[PDB]
């Protein structure tokens, strides 16, 4: 048959309308079969976690000791390669204690069990796969439906329920590994016991489904409430009193208060996890009716919204003129209506902003701002074709509902046309050339009458959220997304940089200064933070509130009735909700209103639409409310979550300011139809949040657990394969290490995760060889191997670097330390040098090598789905990029720019970037790397992606078990690695390259003890002087010495150390003369200090980084480059 049960991870919401349709005698053939296998006790699909939580496996069913010894070997090689060798006795012991404890080990084996069954059952032409035993459970897989059984109890499920159970087990495996590796590296002891207690406590809650996810949703606000209640010193808060955890689950309550008693920081890290547990089944009828009711509710009167919208327009006008005077030193083109004040006239003619205007914004109701700029109606289509699912037209509504269910429910056929009858995505509309004339399509929005084919919106629930009634996002048609792109681009470009409250957020230096002043300020009794959360932010805005500011934007951008069509658009848009087997009724080809499944006409559109307007609108009433009570305020704003910084007044205690500020904000929130609740806002001076990072006493809270416990999308934009899974794991380790997670924890987690991700797919012949597993984790994508979290230098260092010296350093350390010969390295690397130089690969990546990478999958969308272009359509502008080869023109310009005799790949990659060629390759890259094209083009041509998966799996297994060697790399793996990378680049490319070779720091610089350093080593070194003796708690508290800038993990330790460049005897500080990148060297010295402190040692004397490789210091000159041949571009 066709492909079935395609997804390998949870991407869709968990709905149960199909199970209800199946259990009420459907006439579909697979429903009869699925109804047959159910037992006498059939549980509801909502209690699937009660049935999946009873799985127990026999102990030690999978032999994984080879993985343990291999992981110790890999980490010993890396720690020996950095020449930071106090770390390994903490590191391999941490990995061994992680994988030897049985409670962690059982969750590993359970992870491999679900991963193997997902590997077997997905993408199968077999409709019904027979009984598959997972421990003590039997599974029958009848198309989408899943039948589980233990003894006599059963549960009819969909396949997303099984994927949610698999992802829950995967998340717990990540959490149990990361907890051990993180807790090995504090002064504070291990905390695995509390994590196991939390697992048993949450698994011991025998409560109904809604109440259980009420407890699950509320764990992190309650823990934050306990921390805020115990650790507030000036303002008093009562946030913990709302929640029902002490009166429903006392066992969770005692655990959270004992973790609060031991460590405040630990409670936030443990309580931040919210996707390591099971996921709710969304009650579609009740949540749907509440959603369609929340789009039609009128909390305030129509006239009061219009009056307060005029009041918000006044302060918008005030901030725009303030920003224009602050930047361009003159007033904008404005019109003064009769009755204007004399101060406004005198300040307009003099071109000056007085301090007294900001407190009097009622005067700015007669100043009409004229045409500032014009509207760029043709936008960038980088963001047009990405991240959104888009319906073609109105008549595609019949394709989201089953015909048989509609036949039984309403008694007549759907009469759906069998063809797709529209573009599946935006680029499919680009093939047909609808988007060649963007103003001709935005013209019905401009006049004011949008077409009948564009007034439909489908509401899709959002996956992996903890709300039992669900959250919903808008799926719109073609024109309204282009409208949103033009509107948001216009506001972000011209409107927002003038407004100061937004301009401080969109500027890096001002935001850094504000967050740096906050951390020093809050601990010394000055300033406090007020947080507001809007539960109905996107559904609360109304047409009366937006229309004054929308009209003023129409006048400023000289676009007639353009921002004012979006407010009146919800009152004419048909709203249907996407859940098949519950279809809306159709009368004449159009949906019919019944209040639950269809709605003809709301008063708001949905979540994420018109965002930049509502952000300005949200800021306006807060500026009004806090200026009316005379407090110094700074507003940092991220959508529905607003955090407000309020400083001290000298007369009044801060509790009084908190009461008056909450009163003013609650007063001015009510007038816009957005009622804040007293049970969802806290005022604190110790705890705050900005940019998904929580801050306690001015120090960031470690977020290793949440980032590593997150399950990524996996096998990105392709058919399932090993390469993309390891690439997703490597990207997840790098993205976790970006946001202040320690590089050792991410590295030691990722080694074990990489090994288990191999063990799921690779046959038992490979995985019982220790030396092969040690080498295969140390090859990397640089020299033709697999993606690897170990081989990246971007983990330890922020900036981009040259990967080849690091790779040769690891592979050189492997031969000298571990008992591995060079024959196995030549077996796993398989270096196949191409006789033809491919300069295009060099300018797409300046450090790449002319090698053969056989593990990278075929793209198949690149320029190879071109068959639809020649048949479906005739004239379009995207076909100009597709039908002609820009690869041949790129190769031509590559041979043109290869003639530069002092060849610089960085300069070449610049000149392609400044040209039309690599720009067009970037456009073609945007079409292949986009959402809604991959899934839709994957759903068409169904069998090829599964057949390619089987072919690639057989190919990678036969390649990995092959023992044929490649190029002999013994001279490239001896001596210095800097010259080795140069000679290897000469071997692949044929010509020498100067400028892209960055020598690796531990190769370049050798840490030495201060008492035991040799004099020739002491002569050329960088001295790192501590001001006092440094111990474990110095990594938390910032020191007296100033921060340079480094990486953020050693920033606190950098404030206790003084470093200076004292190698001037050999090299006089090398400003633009030699190959020393100072940020890497100072970061490496601070990493030496960190490795000494965290391994049980102390630092008392100034330590030194001494030069070790003489050849690693080679000149960069004032070298002129001459491009010899004439350009044929």
């Amino acid at each position: 048959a066709g492909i079935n049960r395609t997804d390998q991870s949870l991407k869709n919401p968990l709905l149960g309308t199909e199970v209800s349709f199946c259990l009420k005698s459907s006439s579909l053939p697979h429903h009869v079969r699925a109804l047959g296998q159910i037992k006498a006790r059939n549980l509801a699909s909502c209690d699937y976690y009660l049935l999946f939580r009873q799985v127990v496996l026999p102990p030690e069913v999978y032999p994984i000791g080879v993985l343990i010894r291999a992981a110790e070997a890999i980490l010993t090689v890396i720690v020996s390669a950095w020449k930071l060798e106090h770390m390994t006795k903490t590191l391999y012991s941490s990995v061994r204690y992680a994988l030897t404890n049985p409670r962690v080990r059982a969750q590993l084996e359970l992870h491999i069990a679900y991963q193997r069954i997902v590997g077997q059952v997905s993408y199968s032409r077999e409709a019904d796969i027979g009984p598959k035993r997972l421990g003590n459970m039997s599974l029958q897989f009848v198309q989408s439906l899943v039948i589980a059984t233990i003894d006599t109890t059963s549960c009819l499920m969909t396949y997303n329920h099984f994927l949610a159970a698999a992802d829950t087990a995967k998340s717990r495996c990540h959490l149990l590994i990361a907890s051990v590796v993180q807790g090995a590296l504090w002064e504070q002891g291990s905390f695995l016991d509390h994590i196991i207690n939390l697992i048993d406590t949450i698994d011991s809650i025998n409560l109904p489904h809604d109440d259980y996810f009420t407890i699950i949703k509320s764990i992190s606000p309650y823990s934050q409430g306990l921390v805020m209640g115990r650790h507030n010193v000036s303002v008093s808060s009562d946030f913990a009193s709302v929640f029902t955890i002490p009166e429903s689950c006392p066992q969770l309550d005692s655990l959270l208060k004992k973790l609060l008693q031991l460590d405040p920081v630990l409670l936030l890290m443990v309580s931040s996890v919210q996707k390591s547990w099971y996921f709710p089944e969304i009650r579609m009828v009740d949540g749907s009716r509440e959603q369609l009711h929340k789009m039609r509710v009128e909390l305030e009167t129509p006239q009061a919204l219009l009056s307060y919208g005029h009041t918000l327009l006044s302060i918008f006008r005030a901030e725009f003129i303030k920003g224009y005077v602050s930047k361009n030193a003159k007033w904008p083109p404005v019109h003064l209506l009769p009755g204007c004040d004399k101060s406004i006239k005198n300040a307009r003619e003099l071109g000056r902003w007085s301090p007294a205007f900001d407190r009097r914004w009622q005067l700015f109701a007669k100043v009409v701002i004229l045409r500032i700029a014009d509207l760029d109606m043709d936008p960038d289509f980088n963001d047009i074709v990405s991240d959104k699912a888009i319906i073609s037209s109105r008549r595609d509504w019949v394709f989201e509902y089953n015909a048989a269910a509609f036949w039984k429910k309403y008694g007549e056929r759907l009469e759906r046309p069998p063809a797709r009858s529209g573009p599946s995505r935006l680029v499919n509309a680009l093939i047909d050339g609808r988007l060649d004339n963007i103003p001709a399509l935005l013209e019905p929005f401009y006049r004011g009458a949008v077409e009948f084919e564009d007034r439909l919106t489908v509401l899709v629930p959002k996956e992996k959220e903890l709300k039992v009634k669900g959250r919903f996002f808008s799926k719109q048609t073609l024109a309204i997304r282009i409208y949103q792109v033009v509107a948001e681009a216009a506001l972000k470009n011209e409107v927002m940089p003038y407004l100061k409250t937004h301009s401080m957020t969109m500027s890096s230096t001002a935001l850094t200064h504000l967050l740096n002043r906050l951390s020093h300020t809050i601990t010394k009794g000055d300033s406090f933070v007020i947080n507001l959360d809007y539960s109905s932010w996107c559904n609360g805005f109304r047409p009366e509130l937006q229309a004054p500011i929308c009209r003023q934007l129409d006048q400023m951008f000289n676009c007639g009735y353009f921002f004012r069509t979006g407010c009146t658009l919800p009152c004419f848009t048909t709203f249907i909700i996407q859940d098949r087997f519950n279809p809306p009724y159709s009368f004449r080809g159009e949906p019919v209103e019944d209040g639950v499944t269809c709605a003809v006409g709301t008063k708001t559109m949905g979540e994420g639409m018109r965002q930049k307007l509502w952000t300005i609108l949200t800021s306006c009433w807060e500026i009004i409310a806090l200026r009316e009570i005379n407090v110094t305020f700074n507003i940092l704003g991220q959508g529905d979550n607003q955090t407000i910084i309020i400083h001290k007044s000298a007369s009044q205690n801060n509790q009084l300011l908190a009461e008056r500020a909450l009163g003013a904000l609650y007063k001015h929130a009510r007038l816009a139809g957005h009622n804040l609740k007293v049970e969802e806002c806290w005022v604190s001076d110790c705890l705050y949040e900005y940019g998904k990072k929580l801050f306690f006493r001015g120090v960031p809270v470690p977020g290793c657990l949440k980032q590593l416990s997150r399950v990524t999308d996996s096998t990105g934009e392709l058919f399932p394969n090993l390469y993309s899974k390891l690439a997703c794991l490597t990207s997840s380790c790098l993205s976790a290490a970006m946001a202040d997670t320690s590089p050792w924890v991410a590295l030691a987690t990722g080694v074990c995760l990489y090994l288990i991700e191999l063990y799921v797919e690779l046959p038992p012949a490979i995985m019982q060889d220790e030396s092969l597993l040690t080498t295969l984790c140390l090859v990397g994508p640089s020299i033709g191997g697999l993606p690897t979290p170990a081989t990246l230098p971007s983990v330890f260092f922020r900036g981009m670097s040259d990967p080849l010296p690091f790779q040769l350093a690891l592979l050189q350390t492997l031969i000298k330390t571990t008992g591995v010969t060079c024959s196995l390295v030549n077996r796993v690397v398989k270096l196949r040098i191409a006789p033809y130089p491919d300069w295009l690969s060099l300018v797409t990546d300046p450090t790449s090598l002319n090698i053969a990478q056989v593990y990278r999958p075929e793209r198949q969308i690149r320029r190879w789905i071109e068959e639809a272009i020649a048949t479906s359509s005739h004239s379009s502008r995207i076909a100009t990029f597709f039908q002609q080869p820009l690869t041949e023109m790129a190769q031509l310009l590559a041979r043109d720019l290869s003639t530069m005799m002092p060849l610089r790949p960085r300069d070449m990659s610049a000149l392609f970037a400044l040209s039309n060629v690599a720009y067009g390759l970037s456009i073609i890259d945007l079409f292949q790397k986009s959402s809604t094209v991959v899934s839709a083009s994957q759903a068409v041509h169904i069998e090829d992606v599964a057949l390619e998966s089987v072919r690639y799996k057989e190919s990678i297994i036969q390649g990995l078990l092959d023992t044929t060697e490649g190029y002999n790399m013994q001279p490239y793996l001896e001596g210095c690695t800097y010259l080795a990378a140069k000679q290897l680049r000469r071997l692949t490319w044929g010509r020498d390259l100067v400028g892209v070779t960055m020598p690796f720091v531990a190769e370049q610089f050798h840490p030495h003890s201060s008492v035991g350093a040799k004099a020739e080593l002491y002569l050329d070194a960088i001295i790192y002087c501590p001001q006092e003796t440094l111990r474990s708690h110095h990594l938390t508290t910032r020191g007296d010495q100033p921060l340079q800038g480094l990486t953020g993990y050693v920033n606190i330790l950098s404030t206790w150390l003084r470093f200076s460049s004292d190698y001037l005897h050999s090299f006089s500080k090398s400003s633009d003369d030699y190959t020393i990148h100072f940020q890497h060297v100072f970061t490496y010295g601070c990493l030496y200090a960190d490795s000494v402190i965290r391994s049980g040692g102390v630092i008392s004397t100034p330590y030194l980084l001494s030069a070790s490789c003489k050849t690693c210091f080679e000149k960069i000159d004032s070298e002129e480059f001459v491009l010899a041949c004439e350009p044929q571009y």
Partner: protein, 56 residues
Amino acid sequence: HSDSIRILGENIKILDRSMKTMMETMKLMMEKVDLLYASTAVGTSAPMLPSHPAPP
């Protein structure tokens, strides 16, 4: 040649002031009639009718 050129120019400037003053009032009338028609259109199948005439 003072009175002709610059007093007639001042008259056209006063005319332009008065026209923008009228344009603001017509814009407020447009807001009220559009939001009233939009509130009428909720729950029915009333057509969308245009407000601004045509692009130049």
